[PDB]
Design an enzyme around this catalytic site. Structure first.
Site: not given
Ligand code: HEA
Ligand SMILES: [Cu+2]
Ligand SMILES: CCCCCCCCCCCCCCCCCC(=O)OCC(COC(=O)CCCCCCCCCCCCCCCCC)OC(=O)CCCCCCCCCCCCCCCCC
Ligand SMILES: CCCCC/C=C\C/C=C/C/C=C\C/C=C\CCCC(=O)O[C@H](COC(=O)CCCCCCCCCCCCCCCCC)COP(=O)(O)OCCN
Ligand SMILES: CCCCCC/C=C/CCCCCCCCCC(=O)O[C@H](COC(=O)CCCCCCCCCCCCCCC)COP(=O)(O)OC[C@@H](O)CO
Ligand SMILES: CCCCCCCCCCO[C@@H]1O[C@H](CO)[C@@H](O[C@H]2O[C@H](CO)[C@@H](O)[C@H](O)[C@H]2O)[C@H](O)[C@H]1O
Ligand code: CUA
Ligand SMILES: [Mg+2]
Ligand code: NA
Ligand SMILES: [Zn+2]
Lengths: 98, 43, 514, 49, 46, 105, 227, 84, 144, 58, 73, 79, 259
Positions: C61, C91, C126, C156-157, C240, C242, C244, C255, C290-291, C316, C319, C438
């Protein structure tokens, strides 16, 4: 000491690379490598926009450091004006238009 | 955005058909495998 | 003709079109996989009768949705269609190399499907951690196949990233600086940079896993002095960025949509928006552990990674507020694309905020490897990335095809999807707070209510997928051809008509210096 | 001139909502799905040992 | 040159809506079906 | 930036240009309705007279509709503007959108 | 253990987990504050016919929306880091126990004095006794004295596992070749449940952890009896 | 930076060739000779069947599965000791 | 007024609140009598009748502000259809329960649940707030 | 050696509608057909291997 | 007739924004505060109260007699 | 001394969650000390503290594997 | 019809044969690792050489013979090449990280020391030093080549380039010999593992780099390069410097520091 044997671009450049090279020699820019320089852009002194057809897209950066470009088609005929800042542009068929 | 009227209008009846066929192309093969799962578990 | 055009393409539009077809197909596969997960979990007990197979389905998946649906659609699909058109480029820089980026994907995908057919599949998660992924706990070809699939998707990427960066830097009108490019173009450039740096590190880590499995290396095997934690660093150092990489182009499209349906000529705080995506790209390289908060790292390292991760909220936040600020004073057109965008803004924020919770290594001890993590990432992915994909798709569909969608159907589609993804993922917060792990094929009876509801919600989103296919058939079947599009003065990609001709900007645009 | 939503909005709204409520209520309560709700104030504990 | 214009810049025909519907069905339906059949393969393998 | 009075006077001046062309007329209205205000009657009065010099009755009506639209939920703004334009309206023979029945769907 | 329809955390059984509970309330408060504030502003932007579509100046507003979040992050991070260091803090434990993950069961070793060790397997569903919990019961529980600081050492003899007990605030991955340490302290006697928390294969879902917390005197007699 | 020299006058290829033959290649000649005067084999180390060495978790995909690719019988023992 | 698809590079007609005076007139070709109406417009506007004024407006602009900003009943269709399809999904779930899911584990039997409740109460699960805290150990009943 | 670049410039610029990968004449066509035959024959064989490996044979 | 007085005509949106953004904060805070005292303070109190009178031996003895332990009958 | 042993005390040379080296180092020291004595007619019991510590901290299989390796002459630590 | 200076590339089959050839190679490797057969792999390698040969042939045709590399196109090729080298840097980084991780914290199974017990490292003052001087020497002669080319001197360019190639070959033979003689192998724990994988990838890059130089030498023989336009030569030289620098880091980290 001495010894040539390496050809120069003047001797060996061909196709478009050669055309760009010769055209720059005569300070001409037919393949649009350089930014053209704005005129005053009034009715009397419009920005002359060369083209090989009867229309070309113009982008107007109305003010230095605008982030947004204004895009519009410029057609053969009377000068037209940027719909944002009103500066005048006029299509010159030829220069290009071979 | 503005658009021309449809060149080849898809009438409500024609929609019903396209919709029904679309749904069945997804549902039937999955349904058939899921229905026979217990068959597959231990043959 | 057919072969020259479609198999030998050097045209950015056709190739973007091939990416969109590929990702649509992959999306169906990944959707089926997601349904098999929810069917297994939808009542207590065992459905598949084999937890190796449930492990394979979960692992496939993830690969599918990420490497074969999201990236090809956002970067390969919208990136190739819209980048050259947004900067007036005839192009991509390397139009033939571009085509190999696309053609690598079907065989990469074949290798992924092959792995789940040979032996007992790759039931690894994964993340493909060893020793579980190694040649004793997963003997045989399945994991090797997965690794090679990732190789080819990586080559590719990487080549794609080099093409995008080159194109964006070198193929703008000479008068236009980088601070005059649209935000979508920025979002691609940034993403391409993160790809360029992160994918080689993954390729290095999984090559080491390959040699542990077949060449008697011991990078990850303590019997040789190796260390399974080294794998996790390498993996997450890529992993990580990835994530973003998965959202940035989404940001880019958001936007464009919010600006457009607000009837504004530009987003609020263009330079703050460029700064935010840059800051996010940079900080996305220094937070990866943090993972790894439960692997036994020292306390100071955990304190550092918690602190660095929080900081990401700041850019963030800028934005999110800037998108609201764009709406402000707008002449709001409630198009369906606008609906996806608005849903995006609010659901992404909720997903982002649960990430801020997870960022605390303190609290993460208890939330790690639970469904709270799963809730966090399907919020930002299935209601962030997917919503952006749907909004861009309905917004630019008339530009790619020259036909209009039925707006009313598109609104029905959003409504059903909105209810299905929330019903699916919202209760998973409760499941993770209350301690459900999980990667489980079954659960203690206490967790039954949330799981049953979550599985019912997944069927609602199925119905929305089926509808979407019918909606696209309806558009092609009826053929309402586009006449006029608003705001073309600030949206260059529409100015060549719908669909644009095979070659655009044969004569480039004129832009004065001043 | 009155459109599709004009001729049929009310009819679509009323039948959709009704068909939706009936089938979900039937599904949730008549087909033996086990929800496992809280035993609190519902279940009488019985000696186990 | 290549064909240009709506219905021309795609590798499939939209000349007939019924044939288009059959093709879409095969295309999306084969993707959706695949994992159910991979799951069946694995069960039947053992 | 610049004061209210200075803003109003610039716009009045703009529309009083004796040889205003049609492009300039459109450009001026289209720009003006971008702002967070309903334009002052004296600006609208100048724009109406510009319409008259360009022999464009339909644009004068369209201008009135726009004034009413920009007031949004402030229902008092539009009747006040019409009151203050009443002499110009009578002088130039300009009917309101309501008088033409154009406020009805 | 979790109970049906639970929304939050299991009740804390240790002081560390109680501390996490209050820290979670502080944080979620802020999460509610932010998401409600965003939801209200989204509504506000879409509910007026008034327009202002010309350029707006960004460069005063961005201050607020940069400083405010930075203050809020500091309010989350101060208490979060206090707890982290506390989780790490200087313990002097009275007992060491080792747990070793295997596919798919746990073994436990108490080797301070005598060489005691035993394997801990899930009870199959068909063998549960009335009132026992599906997937959670084990044949041999980890018996421990309540109200004492215990060092737990966690490792594995095969693939990765992870030793977790949510109500004690514990989760530590089990990694072959490596000894990870965590400290365990229960304020109460009783039974506390957990589950393997790192995917370790086909039976990942079925290798639970049950602790039995009793008075020291009982723990001592139980140990002698297990040799 | 800096080393012990000059050069920025008469340019280009001539200076780089001067460096190639005046410095670069003579350093190669010196390290070659230095290798020659330290060649002549080291006794093969004594065999101890350490479990962190001679790893075989899967047979190699060539020969008899037990010989590494550049196997040297003189200095590379198998997991059971030197050959013959 | 027949807009053509190949007119894309030419300035075009839009109705938008926020762009009240578009780049071209709605109608560009005039009949004999419309030409004569445009001639009239050049004289005093007091002389035009209401009809004439309206007609002038309709040659310049396609929809009035009132017409372009009109609300619709579309919402009824969208909410109703959403509901229909959501109701439809319940039929798939019924199908699944009937032909795919087998029996649930016996630990869901009413008798099992009563005994397991008791055991959970004897081990004082979540005694602080969650579970046992809601049992009145003295009166042997759920706290009212 | 002799500088023959001008001759190749002339050959490869000849207006005969051929794509650059075939402009060199018969030899291009052969190499092209050999590559394409190997790649498609190879892919078919890799499909056969995959199908084969997807079953146990003991 | 009677003339109408001149109403406010400028900065209407900004005025609406200045008013509502105070409500936005009020409601945000309100929701935060509600959480603070309907959940968070309630939780401190429940824990403080639970252990104020708590006897771990009394709790054990009860559990012991209900027959739950392997190590203590 | 310390016939008082409950368990291994905190050792500030190994202050973190990873305690692998604490097991290992105490195993080496024991065996170094045991071989330091025994050779020179000495009493092993001065080593005892190292033994209690490693026995507390080291998993049985690590200990048993390392002893087997000492016995065969493959143990890789210097004793 | 174009009035930009960019290159619209004729439709081409090489991306697809390349992609297929990637499938054959990875398919092949799998078949080799697991089912004892090399046939697919051989096929994949074959179609990969053919693809590379034809694709880069076509690039030479587009440029030297058709004149499509205007300065705007040439500038794109410079960016592409730099970016490609960057991605190769991050690839080696992962193996450096593996090495530093293992050696800064040697585990008990290793004897808890570095080098591990039972490993007899090479003397870094011997052949590894010779190898160092050899790659450094070729960085000087290739710079001589570049300047001969820029000053229009055919003879000396060919002679500096030949010398650079010969040193490349010499490094490759010295390294092969060292491999044969090393008393430890790829299966000797994480030491053999980090040694042979990091230096073996490097040796492969020396091979690719030498090949690229050989290509430039033949193009030079055939007068393709002008004194102002010879990008394939500049790209081969960046790549050559890259390989050189990565060796220096190998030598300091693995041979010297890690010995
Ligand atoms: C596109 C996908 C995506 C995105 C954008 C993010 C964004 C973020 N992620 Fe996430 N995350 C994943 C996809 C994503 N994550 C995936 C797939 C996993 C699991 C991997 C796995 O185990 O399989 C994961 C796991 C993951 C973990 C692991 C937890 C664990 O395994 O125990 C953590 C821990 O810090 C984390 C944190 C964050 C944080 C801090 C952000 C930040 O970038 C978010 C920031 C956005 C905001 C904060 C909100 C908008 C902001 C405001 C409105 C302003 C004011 C806010 C404050 C003052 C707080 N993420
Ligand atoms: Cu991460
Ligand atoms: C946000 C996405 C969209 C949501 C819509 C889809 C789903 C519908 C839910 C729609 C209802 C949403 C309202 C909030 C529910 C929170 C439940 C709670 O009491 O929270 C408590 C904790 C657990 O804490 C406790 O231990 C103490 C609780 C006391 C127990 C006694 C029982 C009292 C019950 C009261 C609530 C019942 C909820 C059950 C509900 C179960 C049904 C799913 O759980 C958690 O942390 C959950 C983690 C969620 C993190 C994301 C938060 C941001 C959402 C934005 C909201 C903005 C305004 C809403 C505006 C609402 C707009 C519609
Ligand atoms: C002459 C110096 C130059 C070295 C190149 C020569 C050999 C060909 C291999 C090159 C490919 C790259 C390296 C792969 C890893 C192994 C190479 C290490 C170098 C080497 O050749 O190591 C040898 C072991 O080789 C072995 O297993 C040989 C096994 C060969 C099988 C290759 C396995 C394929 C690996 C997959 C590559 C995929 C990575 C691509 C990433 C794509 C990016 C996205 C050393 O011999 P030994 O007898 O153990 O010790 C010496 C005893 N006297
Ligand atoms: C013994 C066999 C074993 C070897 C195995 C595989 C072999 C690899 C082959 C080595 C590489 C050969 C590359 C030759 C490219 C020739 C094309 C070329 O050089 O084309 C030049 C352009 O550069 C361009 O495309 C840029 C082209 C750059 C290519 C970069 C090369 C790196 C590719 C290597 C892949 C590394 C992967 C390793 C990871 C595992 C053409 O422009 P100029 O030079 O200005 O000429 C025109 C003038 O005449 C104008 O007057
Ligand atoms: C996650 C996505 C899944 C969603 C669920 C799909 C919804 C249902 C689709 C219909 O599926 C069909 O149902 C029949 C049962 O109703 C099966 O017939 C089976 O049962 C019939 C009657 O019992 C016999 O006539 C048939 O021969 C026998 O194959 C049939 O194969 C299957 O296609
Ligand atoms: Cu053991 Cu999961
Ligand atoms: Mg984990
Ligand atoms: Na299940
Ligand atoms: Zn302008």
């Amino acid at each position: 000491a001495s010894g040539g044997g390496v050809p120069t671009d003047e001797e060996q450049a061909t196709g478009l690379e050669r055309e760009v090279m010769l055209a720059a020699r005569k300070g001409q820019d037919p393949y649009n490598i350089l930014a053209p320089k704005a005129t005053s852009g009034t009715k009397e002194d419009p920005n002359l926009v060369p083209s090989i057809t009867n229309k070309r897209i113009v982008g107007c950066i109305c003010e230095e450091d605008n982030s947004t470009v204004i895009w519009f088609w410029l057609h053969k005929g009377e000068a037209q004006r940027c719909p944002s800042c009103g500066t005048h542009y006029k299509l010159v068929p030829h220069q290009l238009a071979h | 955005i503005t658009a021309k009227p449809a060149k080849t209008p898809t009438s409500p009846k024609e929609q019903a058909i396209g919709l029904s066929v679309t749904f069945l192309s997804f549902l039937l093969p999955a349904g058939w495998v899921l229905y026979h799962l217990d068959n597959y578990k231990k043959s | 003709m057919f072969i020259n055009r479609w198999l030998f393409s050097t045209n950015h539009k056709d190739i973007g079109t091939l990416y969109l077809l590929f990702g649509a197909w992959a999306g169906m596969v990944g959707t089926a996989l997601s349904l098999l997960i929810r069917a297994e979990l939808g009542q207590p007990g065992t459905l598949l009768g084999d937890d190796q197979i449930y492990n394979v389905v979960v692992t496939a998946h993830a690969f599918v949705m990420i490497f074969f649906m999201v990236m090809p659609i956002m970067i390969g699909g919208f990136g190739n269609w819209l980048v050259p058109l947004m900067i007036g480029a005839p192009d991509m820089a390397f139009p033939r190399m571009n085509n190999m980026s696309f053609w690598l994907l079907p065989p990469s995908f074949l290798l992924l499907l092959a792995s789940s057919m040979v032996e007992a599949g790759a039931g690894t998660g994964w993340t493909v951690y060893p020793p579980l992924a190694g040649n004793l706990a997963h003997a045989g070809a399945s994991v090797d196949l997965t690794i090679f699939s990732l190789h080819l998707a990586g080559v590719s990427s990487i080549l794609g990233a080099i093409n995008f960066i080159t194109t964006i830097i070198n193929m703008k009108p000479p008068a236009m600086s980088q601070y005059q490019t649209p935000l979508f173009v920025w979002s691609v450039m940034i993403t391409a940079v993160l790809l360029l740096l992160s994918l080689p590190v993954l390729a290095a880590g999984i090559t080491m896993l390959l040699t542990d499995r077949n060449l008697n290396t011991t990078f990850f095997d303590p019997a040789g002095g190796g260390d399974p934690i080294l794998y996790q660093h390498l993996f997450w150092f890529f992993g990580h960025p990835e994530v973003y990489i998965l959202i940035l182009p989404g940001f880019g499209m958001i936007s464009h949509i919010v600006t457009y349906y607000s009837g504004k000529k530009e987003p609020f705080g263009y330079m703050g928006m460029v700064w935010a995506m840059m800051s996010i790209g940079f900080l996305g390289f220094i937070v990866w552990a943090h993972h790894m908060f439960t692997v036994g790292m020292d306390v100071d390292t955990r304190a550092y990674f918690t602190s660095a991760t929080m900081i990401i909220a700041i850019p963030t936040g800028v934005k999110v507020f800037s998108w609201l600020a764009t709406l402000h004073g707008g002449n709001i057109k409630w198009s369906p694309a606008m609906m996806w965008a608005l849903g995006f803004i609010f659901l992404f924020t909720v997903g982002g905020l649960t990430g801020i919770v997870l960022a605390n290594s303190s609290l993460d001890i208890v939330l790690h490897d639970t469904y709270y993590v799963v809730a966090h990432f399907h919020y930002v992915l299935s209601m962030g990335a997917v919503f952006a994909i749907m909004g861009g798709f309905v917004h630019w569909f008339p530009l790619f095809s020259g036909y209009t969608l039925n707006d009313t159907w598109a609104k029905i589609h959003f409504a059903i999807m909105f209810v299905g993804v929330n019903m699916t993922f919202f209760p998973q917060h409760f499941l993770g707070l209350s301690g459900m792990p999980r990667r489980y094929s079954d659960y203690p009876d206490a967790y039954t209510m949330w799981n049953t509801i979550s599985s019912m919600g997944s069927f609602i989103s199925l119905t929305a997928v089926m509808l979407m296919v019918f909606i696209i058939w309806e558009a092609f079947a009826s053929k309402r051809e586009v006449l006029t599009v608003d705001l073309t003065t600030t949206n260059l990609e529409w100015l060549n008509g719908c669909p644009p001709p095979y070659h655009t900007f044969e004569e480039p645009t004129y832009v004065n210096l001043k | 001139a009155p459109d599709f939503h004009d001729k049929y909005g009310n009819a679509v709204l009323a039948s959709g909502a009704t068909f939706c409520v009936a089938v979900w209520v039937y599904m949730a309560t008549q087909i033996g799905i086990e929800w496992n709700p809280s035993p609190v104030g519902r279940v009488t504990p019985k000696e186990w040992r | 040159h290549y064909e240009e214009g709506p219905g021309k810049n795609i590798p499939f025909s939209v000349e007939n809506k019924w044939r288009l519907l059959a093709m879409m069905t095969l295309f999306f339906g084969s993707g959706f079906a695949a994992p159910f059949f991979i799951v069946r393969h694995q069960l039947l393998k053992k | 930036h610049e004061t209210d009075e200075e803003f109003d006077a610039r716009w009045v001046t703009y529309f009083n240009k004796p040889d205003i062309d049609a492009w300039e007329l459109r450009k001026g209205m289209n720009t003006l309705v971008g702002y967070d205000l309903v334009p002052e009657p004296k600006i609208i009065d100048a724009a109406l007279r510009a319409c008259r010099r360009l022999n464009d009755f339909a644009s004068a009506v369209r201008i009135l509709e726009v004034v009413k639209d920009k007031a949004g939920p402030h229902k008092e703004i539009y009747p006040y503007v019409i009151q203050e334009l009443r002499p110009t309206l009578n002088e130039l023979g300009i009917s309101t959108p309501e008088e033409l029945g154009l406020d009805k769907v | 253990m979790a109970y049906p329809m639970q929304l939050g955390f299991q009740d804390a059984t240790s002081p560390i987990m109680e501390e996490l509970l209050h820290f979670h309330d502080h944080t979620l408060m802020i999460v509610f504050l932010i998401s409600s504030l965003v939801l209200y502003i989204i509504s506000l932007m879409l509910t007026t016919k008034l327009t202002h579509t010309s350029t707006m100046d960004a460069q005063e507003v961005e201050t607020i929306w940069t400083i405010l979040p930075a203050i809020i992050l500091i309010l989350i991070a101060l208490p979060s880091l206090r707890i982290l260091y506390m989780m790490d803090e200087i313990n002097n434990p009275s007992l060491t126990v080792k747990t070793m993950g295997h596919q798919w069961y746990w073994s436990y070793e108490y080797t301070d004095y005598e060489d005691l060790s035993f394997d801990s397997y899930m009870i199959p569903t068909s063998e549960l006794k009335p009132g026992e919990l599906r997937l959670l019961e084990v044949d041999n529980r980890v018996v421990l004295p309540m109200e004492m600081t215990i060092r737990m050492l966690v490792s594995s003899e095969d693939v990765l596992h992870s030793w977790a007990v949510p109500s004690l605030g514990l989760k530590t991955d089990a990694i072959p070749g490596r000894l990870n340490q965590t400290t365990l302290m229960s304020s109460r006697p009783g039974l506390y449940y957990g589950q393997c928390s790192e995917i370790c294969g086909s039976n990942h879902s079925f290798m639970p952890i049950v602790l039995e917390l009793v008075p020291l005197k009982y723990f001592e007699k139980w140990s002698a009896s297990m040799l | 930076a800096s080393a012990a020299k000059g050069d920025h006058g008469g340019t280009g290829a001539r200076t780089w060739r001067f460096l190639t033959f005046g410095l670069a290649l003579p350093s190669v000649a010196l390290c070659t000779l230095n290798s020659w005067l330290h060649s002549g084999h080291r006794e093969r180390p004594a065999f101890i069947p350490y479990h962190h060495l001679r790893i075989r978790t899967k047979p190699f995909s060539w020969g008899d599965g037990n010989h590494t690719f550049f196997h040297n019988p003189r200095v590379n023992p198998l997991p059971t000791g030197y050959e013959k | 007024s027949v807009v053509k698809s190949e007119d894309y590079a030419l300035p075009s007609y839009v109705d938008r609140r926020d762009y009240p005076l578009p780049d071209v007139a709605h109608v560009k070709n005039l009949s004999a009598s419309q030409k004569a109406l445009k001639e009239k417009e050049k004289a005093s506007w007091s002389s035009l009748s209401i009809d004439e004024k309206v007609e002038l407006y309709r040659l310049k602009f396609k929809e009035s502000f009132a017409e372009m900003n009109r609300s619709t009943n579309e919402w009824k269709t969208v909410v109703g259809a959403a509901m229909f399809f959501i109701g439809f999904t319940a039929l798939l779930l019924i199908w699944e329960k009937h032909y795919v899911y087998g029996p649930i584990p016996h630990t869901f039997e009413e008798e099992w649940v009563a005994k397991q409740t008791k055991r959970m109460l004897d081990m004082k699960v979540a005694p602080i707030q969650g579970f046992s805290a809601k049992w009145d150990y003295d009166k042997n009943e759920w706290k009212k | 050696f002799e500088n023959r670049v001008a001759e190749k410039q002339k050959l490869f610029q000849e207006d005969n509608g051929l794509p650059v990968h075939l402009k060199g004449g018969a030899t291009d066509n052969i190499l092209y057909r050999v590559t394409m035959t190997l790649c498609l024959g190879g892919t078919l064989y890799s499909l056969y291997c995959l199908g084969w490996a997807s079953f146990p044979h003991k | 007739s009677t003339a109408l007085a001149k109403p406010q005509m400028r900065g209407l949106l900004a005025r609406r924004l200045r008013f509502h953004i105070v409500g936005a904060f009020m409601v945000s805070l309100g929701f935060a505060t509600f959480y603070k005292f309907a959940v968070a303070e309630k939780r401190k109190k429940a824990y403080a109260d639970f252990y104020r009178n708590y006897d771990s031996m009394k709790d054990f003895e009860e559990m012991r007699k209900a027959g739950i332990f392997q190590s203590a009958k | 001394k310390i016939k008082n042993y409950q368990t291994a005390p905190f050792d500030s040379r190994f202050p973190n969650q990873n305690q692998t080296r604490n097991c290992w180092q105490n195993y080496l020291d024991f065996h170094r000390c045991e071989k330091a004595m025994t050779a020179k007619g000495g009493d092993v019991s001065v080593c005892e503290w190292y033994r209690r510590v490693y026995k507390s901290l080291c998993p049985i299989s690590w200990v048993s594997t390392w002893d087997d390796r000492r016995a065969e002459g493959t143990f890789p630590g210097k004793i | 019809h174009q009035t930009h200076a960019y290159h619209m590339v004729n439709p081409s089959p090489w991306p697809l044969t390349g992609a297929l050839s990637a499938l054959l190679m990875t398919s092949g490797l799998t078949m080799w690792f697991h089912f004892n057969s090399m046939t697919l792999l051989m096929i994949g390698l074959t179609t990969n050489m053919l693809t590379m040969y034809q694709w880069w042939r076509d690039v030479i045709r587009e440029s030297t013979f058709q004149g499509h590399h205007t300065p705007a196109v040439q500038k794109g090729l410079r960016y592409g090449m730099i970016l490609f080298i960057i991605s190769e840097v991050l690839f080696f980084t992962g193996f450096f990280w593996a090495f530093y991780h293992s050696s800064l914290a040697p585990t008990p199974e290793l004897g808890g020391c570095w080098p591990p017990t039972g490993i007899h490292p090479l003397n870094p003052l011997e052949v590894p030093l010779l190898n160092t001087s050899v790659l450094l020497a070729s960085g000087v002669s290739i710079t001589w080549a570049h300047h001969s080319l820029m000053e229009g001197d055919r003879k000396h360019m060919l002679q500096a380039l030949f010398i650079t190639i010969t040193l490349g070959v010499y490094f490759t033979l010295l390294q092969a010999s060292e491999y044969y003689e090393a008393p430890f192998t790829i299966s000797d724990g994480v030491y053999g593992s980090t040694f042979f994988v990091a230096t073996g990838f490097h040796g492969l890059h020396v091979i690719i780099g030498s090949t690229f130089l050989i290509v430039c030498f033949f193009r030079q023989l055939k007068f393709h390069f002008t004194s102002n336009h010879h990008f394939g030569f500049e790209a081969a030289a960046w790549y050559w410097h890259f390989v050189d620098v990565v060796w220096l880091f190998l030598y300091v980290s693995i041979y010297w520091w890690g010995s």
